[PDB]
Amino acid sequence: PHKSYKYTYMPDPRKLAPIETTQRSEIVPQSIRPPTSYVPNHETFLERA
Amino acid sequence: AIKRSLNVGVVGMGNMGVPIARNLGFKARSAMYLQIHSRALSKAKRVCDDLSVDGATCAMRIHDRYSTMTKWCDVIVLALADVKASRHALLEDNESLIMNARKGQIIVDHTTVDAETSRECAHEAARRGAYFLDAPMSGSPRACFNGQLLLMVGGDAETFQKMLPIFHMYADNVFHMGESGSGTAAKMISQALVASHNAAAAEALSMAHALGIEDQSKLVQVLDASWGSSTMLRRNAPLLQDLIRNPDKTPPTSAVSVDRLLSDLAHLDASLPKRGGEDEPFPVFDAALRSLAAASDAGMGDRDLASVVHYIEAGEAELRNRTHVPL
Amino acid sequence: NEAEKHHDLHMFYTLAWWKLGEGIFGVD
Amino acid sequence: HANTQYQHAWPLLSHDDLGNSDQSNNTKNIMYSMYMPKRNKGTAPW
Amino acid sequence: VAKLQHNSAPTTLNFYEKSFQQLSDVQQRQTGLLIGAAVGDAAARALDGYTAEEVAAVAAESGSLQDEDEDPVVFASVTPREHKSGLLRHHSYTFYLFSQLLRVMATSRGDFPVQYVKNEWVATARAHPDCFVREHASLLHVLCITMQLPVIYPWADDSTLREYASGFLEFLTETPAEQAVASREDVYAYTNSVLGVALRCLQSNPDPYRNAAFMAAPGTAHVFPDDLALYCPPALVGSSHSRTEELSETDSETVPLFPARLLESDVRVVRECLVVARGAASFAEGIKAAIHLGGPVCQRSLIVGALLGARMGVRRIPISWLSATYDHVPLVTLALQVAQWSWNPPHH
Amino acid sequence: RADVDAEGNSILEPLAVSPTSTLAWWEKWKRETVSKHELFTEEGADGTPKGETFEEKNEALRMMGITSSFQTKDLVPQPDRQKLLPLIRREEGEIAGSLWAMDGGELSYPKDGGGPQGWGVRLWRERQLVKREYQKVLDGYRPVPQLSTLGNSVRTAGDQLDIERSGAQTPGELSDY
Amino acid sequence: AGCRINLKATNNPKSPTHTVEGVFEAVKALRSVSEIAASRGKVPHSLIYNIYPYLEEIRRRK
Amino acid sequence: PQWDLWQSRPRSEDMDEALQPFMDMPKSLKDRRYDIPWWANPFGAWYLQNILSLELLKLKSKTNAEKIATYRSYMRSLASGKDNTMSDDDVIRNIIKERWKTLEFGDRNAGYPCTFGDYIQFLNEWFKSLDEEGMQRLREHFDRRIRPLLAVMSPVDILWLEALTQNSPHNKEQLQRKIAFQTSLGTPEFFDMSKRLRYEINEDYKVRDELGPELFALWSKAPERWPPERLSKMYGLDFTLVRKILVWHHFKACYDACVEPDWSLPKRLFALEWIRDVRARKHGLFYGKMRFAEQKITFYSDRFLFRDLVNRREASYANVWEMDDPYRFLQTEQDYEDYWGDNYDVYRRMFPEMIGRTGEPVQQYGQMPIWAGPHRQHANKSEHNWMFAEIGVNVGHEALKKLELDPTNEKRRRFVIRQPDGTLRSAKMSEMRAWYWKEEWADFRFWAPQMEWGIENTPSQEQYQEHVPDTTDADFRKQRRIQSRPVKWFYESEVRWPDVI
Amino acid sequence: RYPVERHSAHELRFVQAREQLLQRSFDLLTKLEKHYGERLLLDRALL
Amino acid sequence: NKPLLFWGTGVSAVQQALRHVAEDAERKRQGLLLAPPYPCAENPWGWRLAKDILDDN
């Protein structure tokens, strides 16, 4: 096109600025409580709810 | 001997060459000058224009001549369709990359090739003083866009270590198999396993339909739970079920084609050592080869691999005729 | 879209410029 | 899906679509603010 | 220019690495004084109290270098012979008082009386009784405390800086009981001379040590290097009369106890620190030379690194050492606040 | 280590550029020439750095190892005296075309197809401008041009013979001869 | 320039001769800045330009 | 190995044709072509025999005298004894000129050295053998020599030249028969203008490729001693043209050395122009240029505005460059590359005036104690940067942006940023200015440290004390001082050191 | 690596991580042997 | 940098001409024509091979 400019269409530098991501699992995990005697199975849990 | 950026070139804007170049342009934070070679300059113009519009972080330069590509690029990666094009681009052309290679250049061809071609390419590169790697890529173009490809690199360990930061831009599973040609051998083994498992999955779904199982998801679930799980089966369960249910439907096209699979298996057979007059008696591999050949002999070579289900019996009839000819 | 290859510029060299320019092809 | 929306950036010291350039006097340059609609319902980027 | 991304190399090595570029030259020198003082103190805290031969033995013992690790003397991993509780594990009592004064200055946003920090200093002294008697009313201690006073207004002349620092030095040399600590004037004069050195370093004067020797307080020729001692003003006849009055007591059985370390020894240590700072071409080598001399390495570094920072700005301080400093984040924040507010105090 | 990083992994390094390249020559010249601080000890007479005069410029280039071809001010081409090229650039376009070309780009040439923006129309307009200039020459607003190679080749044999044997540079000199 | 033509008062508004005559009469009745300055006794440039020395030109010579 | 013009390198077969007729040549006749050396073509053989041999004669050899004797004898036969004093190089040049002029195209074996088709083939293959630099040199030769002739010659003259080139007897007779063709031929008096046109073109090319190295060397060695402005002033060249020549020279050196060009150079030489002109352009939309940055009152309207402008211009640079005082905050090459590469646009749009930095230092705050203990320490961490800005009655005034963002303001607008790890930090200058209405102008001239002082500018303490600030009159200053100073003394209820014996 | 970490200290950290990994691997293989009823701890030469 | 010899520069041309003459013998067996001599739609420039007395049909 011009042979003298990088990024011939001249995008905004913020366009080429990168994006970083961090999942919430890294911030805090999710624990799973094992079933208790009151709700031995998920059927009983749903019936109680 | 000045300080600059690496000149990284990509040769072949086919189906898999575009995602590689796009990944390099996107993930190269101005750390490389991206050269893109094309047989027709219109394709290179289109690729560079699309990369620039989508937003590329590295400057790009288009090429239509292997001589200019060699004089510019410090590292070259070739992603072509067949073996003939790769052989012409590397050894046969007057401006062939390997024959005209400079002392220090690194040429990596991701195209699946034969063992003899890989050996001769490595020998010529070593004689010229450059470095050559055969890294047959594995995966669909969508997987290459996601960057989760598969590379089996054979050659110099130091060269593989140096080229790792470039491979990781479009491939996550990179395995340095060993000396030159080990990547080609691993690709041959993988292709043979793929064909065998595709034939097995097609037969399994055919017998499922024969027995009466009327759901494919509920079958693939228990198959994955059990020891009969297979990637090809999981991928091709719905299409194979539909094709079995309605034989009139013509299987669709895909990047992994019957003709290409047959060509790769033919290269594997050519590189397979012989035991004299008779060949190696692999029953499952021979059955898969015959079924795939019967499928391709119906104009379905450019369609998906699932077409083998309609020509299992075609291959069997052809084998029976050929065996009855001398009987 | 198509790049102008300027092949019409080369057609002017096919005119025997030495007849009038008296050997302009060389260094002068 | 080809590029039909973006165009190559203006090079350095280039002329305007109306011939205006920031060279020497501005007399050859012509103001164009009087051709725009008098009131905009919103806010233009410029 | 650029290198291929691999191994997930972090973009910035520290929080303020790219923030230090956002200061003027004089602001960089101002922040560099405090930050280099802190870095030197933290680097010399490990070998605090060690002798010269002990430091040499440590360096010889840790003679397995992998061509990229820092000097074994700096930030040494030796076992602690002190085992302090919460803060003196990474710094000294002198730097504790220095940090308290820095925080008071940052919250004051300009010049401030000594009463703003009297209570903090006496609270620290009560919290650490052994350190207070060990390093109270000594030249090294008062100098390391008052080194940061010229940061308030680097363009101030010697007379203004000395007048402002007199109030702080009076309380620093004020014994609680009527112990009658002697050589208070001598301590004041030596501290003023070194503060002149630091002020000229902040002002980036050509040969700050030479010009401070020229404009030093009378009777302080023994603290400057011997090649510069000729330019110092001679001892005052008033100082001689004060010495005669002190000798007129004729009480040999009375010995002061708060100045544990002798004034002459403090002067020798400060002279060694000044020669090291003058002959140091980089902050790292200056700190290494300061710690190789043994003795009060914490105060030696607190002087030498402060001078080096005032000479060559923040950005010459190794960012790895800055990150290794324990309280680098609060120290740098306070230094930035002081540098910003020194040029426009709200009260005047 | 050129090809080894901090961790010890082998890293890619660009291939050495051609030692005969002009860029390599510039790099070596910059690295090996005298530093910019030793070109002149005393500065200019009035607050300004030396090197503005041609004598000082030639001395500096000599110290840097370069012999200036433009020793005098008059030896500079001085393109502000041009009377024909600026008119063409102002009206029609860049007559040169390939004067500013990086690599097969930034070319000011007519289109290949032709039509209103083709080589024929471009040359016709340029010839019209040259005809206007020749009309000025005939009217005496411009000096009579000298004898050209094309003009000599066009002239009759007798004219060429007498021009060659007299060494005349202008038609006026030919008329005098 | 800006020109506004109103031919409602005329018996035949759709008259190109009326339009051209009106425009030419308006042009004829126009005085140039040079003529206005000559009539007033002022400098023409000190009538349309915002320079503070021109403020002395609108006062009375004293 | 080594490839040059003498030994042509092997090129690819699928290369496109250079000349138009070869593009329409049928594929069968294309395949009929042989692969032969360049001199195997009759035109190449003619050139090597006639012109290239005489060019080689000037080199040191043994047969040079043997051929020079014959050529001198021929020249003496031509021009009696006058040409005896002519130099040997002049004789060789004359022989080359005569052999170039006497070249004819016709039947190969009837006397003519080569045919027109052979000449066309040689031209096509010679153009094919060129690289990018070869094609650039070819275009340079075209512009230098052939373009003036085309601009000065009529299409009738061009057709006559084509007829001469083909040397067809019947076609030449047909063209000469026409009376209008006879009368439309150009005149030598008008063709003489081609000499001046060629001189101007060669003068511009000589400017470029001879004053480029000299200016480039001066500006690369001592840019501060020889700025582009000084170079243009001393060489009489255009100020813009000098910078253009420098940029072109550097970029051509990079391109022909096969190195990625330093993209920062056009920015570093046209910093003002880059901000003013370089824009992203949409397809199908026509754009304009802002003559003035804003609607302001001209400085000629008031006498004080005129003085202010002349003082500011005195304190301002005429042309700021990379090494000047405002760019002294780029200590190392990392800062240099970051500022001048790929982020110059944002770095210049951050703040209008040129200051000794690009933003403000960022300092982090301290978290308020949480009595809930470790049951709630996690809650302040998230996946995003939470940015908060103060608003209210005293905050948000566009006209007071500078005073509200002044760090030395006791009533400064309060910004906070909670990082995804819970850290509370301040805001950058760009982040703080993002909340106000955008300012999209820049200043490339004014530099504050160069302001006049002493003469006509002397801030006085009397003017500031005219307000009569009295602590006994107004005690708000004491209240703010009390608010700022610490309060830990209140728990101790004269300060004295502890006594231990 | 930490800002002031030594090479020897990094090696010691790697040694400690290696020991922790070895113990956790032994526990995991014990659990897997209990789960499967097979013999997984074959090469018992790292004690 | 090397002699510009004449006697060792005719290798590939001989092989190409051998291929051409073999194909021309088969063409004479088949009555084939290489290309239209006159300027036609597919050959507007009228490219034609030069006649050679020594060459046989």
Residue B62: which of B53, B49, B74, B75 has the closest Cα? Answer: B49
* Gap from C14 CA to chain H (nearest CA, Å): 7
Residue matched to tokens 């602590």 = H471
Residues contacting F94, CB < 8 A, separation 6+: F108
Concatenated DSSP letters of B20-35: HHHHHHHH-SS-EEEE
**Cβ within 8 Å, pair H146-C11:** no
Q: What is the three-class DSSP state of H423? A: coil
Q: Select from H14, H132, H259 the Cβ nearest to the Cβ of B2.
A: H259
Distance CA F25, CA F32 (A): 10
CA H246 to chain centre: 7
Residue B255: which of B52, B112, B88 has the closest Cα? Answer: B112
Distance CA H484, CA B279 (A): 94
Distance CA E200, CA E189 (A): 17
CA F79 to chain centre: 9
Helix axes H88-101, H64-78, angle to 10 degrees: 70
E80, with CB counted inside 10 A (0-12, 13-18, 19+), is exposed
On whether the CB atoms of residues B186 and B112 are closer than 8 A, the answer is no
Handedness of CA H362, H272, F105, F119 (dihedral sign): positive
For residue B41, list chain C residues with Cβ-Cβ distance below 8 A. 3
Q: Which helix (H) or strand (E) holds B176?
A: strand B173-178
Distance CA B8, CA B167 (A): 12
What is the three-state SS of H331-393?
A: CCHHHHHHHHCCCHHHHHHCCCCCCCCCCCCCCECCCCCCCCHHHCHHHHCCCCCEEEECCEC
Q: Which amino acid is at B24?
A: L
Beta-bridge partners for B153: B176
Distance CA B255, CA B252 (A): 10
On whether the CB atoms of residues E95 and E302 are closer than 8 A, the answer is yes
- Candidates A3, A6, A8: best to mutate against F (most CBs of F within 10 A) is A3
Chain A stretch 6-45, residues whose beta carbon is closer than 8 A to a beta carbon of chain B: 6-9, 11, 15-16, 18
On whether the CB atoms of residues A27 and H382 are closer than 8 A, the answer is yes
**Cβ within 8 Å, pair B165-E5:** yes
Q: What share of chain C is helix, strand, coil (3-state, %, to 5)?
A: 30, 0, 70
**Cβ within 8 Å, pair B168-E1:** no
For residue H382, list chain A residues with Cβ-Cβ distance below 8 A. 24, 27
Chains near D (3 or more Cβ pairs under 8 Å): A, B, H
For residue I8, list chain E residues with Cβ-Cβ distance below 8 A. 64
User: Is the CB of E262 inside 8 Å of chain I's CB atoms?
Assistant: no
Chain D touches chain I, with at least 3 Cβ pairs below 8 Å, answer: no
End-to-end CA distance of chain J: 43
User: Is the CB of E9 inside 8 Å of chain B's CB atoms?
Assistant: no
User: Is the CB of H237 inside 8 Å of chain F's CB atoms?
Assistant: yes
Distance CA E345, CA H191 (A): 80
Query: Which residues in B have their CB inside 8 Å of a CB on D?
Result: 46, 49-50, 53
**Cβ within 8 Å, pair F109-C19:** no
User: Is the CB of H262 inside 8 Å of chain E's CB atoms?
Assistant: no
On whether the CB atoms of residues H290 and H441 are closer than 8 A, the answer is no
For residue I7, list chain E residues with Cβ-Cβ distance below 8 A. 66, 68-69
Residue H234: which of H218, H249, H248 has the closest Cα? Answer: H218
CA atoms within 13 A on the CB side of G41: 5
Distance CA H203, CA F76 (A): 10
Burial B26-65 (b: 16+ CB within 10 A, else e): bbbebbbbbbbbbeebebbbbbbbbbbbeebbbbbbbbbb
Handedness of CA H131, H132, H134, H135 (dihedral sign): positive
User: Is the CB of H440 inside 8 Å of chain A's CB atoms?
Assistant: no
Q: Length of chain F in residues, anyone?
A: 177
Alpha helices in H167-192 (DSSP H): 169-177, 179-183, 188-191
Distance CA J44, CA J37 (A): 10
On whether the CB atoms of residues E340 and H408 are closer than 8 A, the answer is yes
On whether the CB atoms of residues E305 and E35 are closer than 8 A, the answer is no
Distance CA H185, CA H183 (A): 6
Q: Select from B3, B164, B168 the Cβ nearest to the Cβ of E1.
A: B3
**Cβ within 8 Å, pair J17-H32:** no
* Gap from H10 CA to chain C (nearest CA, Å): 23
Structure tokens at J42: 């597919």
For residue H101, list chain C residues with Cβ-Cβ distance below 8 A. 18-19, 22-23
For residue F111, list chain C residues with Cβ-Cβ distance below 8 A. 4
Chain D touches chain A, with at least 3 Cβ pairs below 8 Å, answer: yes
* Gap from E123 CA to chain H (nearest CA, Å): 9
On whether the CB atoms of residues H152 and F150 are closer than 8 A, the answer is yes
- Candidates J16, J27, J32, J42: best to mutate against H (most CBs of H within 10 A) is J16
H285, with CB counted inside 10 A (0-12, 13-18, 19+), is exposed
- Candidates H477, H482, H495, H501: best to mutate against E (most CBs of E within 10 A) is H495
Distance CA J2, CA I34 (A): 81
**Cβ within 8 Å, pair F149-C6:** no
Residue B87: which of B51, B121, B44 has the closest Cα? Answer: B121
Q: Select from B5, B102, B162 the Cβ nearest to the Cβ of F15.
A: B102
On whether the CB atoms of residues E248 and E202 are closer than 8 A, the answer is no
**Cβ within 8 Å, pair F10-B104:** no
**Cβ within 8 Å, pair D16-H278:** no
Q: Select from H2, H21, H32 the Cβ nearest to the Cβ of J45.
A: H21
Distance CA H260, CA B9 (A): 13
Beta-bridge partners for B6: B32
Q: Select from D14, D18, D22 the Cβ nearest to the Cβ of H288.
A: D18
> CA dihedral in degrees (B117, B121, B127, B128; nearest 10)?
150
Resolution (Å units)? 3.6
Residues contacting B112, CB < 8 A, separation 6+: B83, B136, B184, B187, B191, B264, B267
Q: Which amino acid is at J17?
A: A
For residue H270, list chain D residues with Cβ-Cβ distance below 8 A. 12-13
Secondary structure letter of residue B137 according to DSSP = E
* Gap from I37 CA to chain E (nearest CA, Å): 41
**Cβ within 8 Å, pair G51-H302:** no
User: Is the CB of A3 inside 8 Å of chain B's CB atoms?
Assistant: no
Backbone angles phi, psi at B2, to 5 degrees: -110, 170
Please give the method by which this entry was determined.
cryo-EM
Chains near G (3 or more Cβ pairs under 8 Å): H
* Gap from I29 CA to chain E (nearest CA, Å): 31
On whether the CB atoms of residues E108 and E116 are closer than 8 A, the answer is yes
Chain C stretch 1-28, residues whose beta carbon is closer than 8 A to a beta carbon of chain B: 1-3
* Gap from H393 CA to chain C (nearest CA, Å): 57
Secondary structure letter of residue H69 according to DSSP = H
For residue H191, list chain F residues with Cβ-Cβ distance below 8 A. 148, 150-151, 154
Q: Strand H281-282 relative to strand D6-7: parallel, antiparallel, unpaired? A: antiparallel
CA atoms within 13 A on the CB side of H426: 21
Chains near J (3 or more Cβ pairs under 8 Å): H
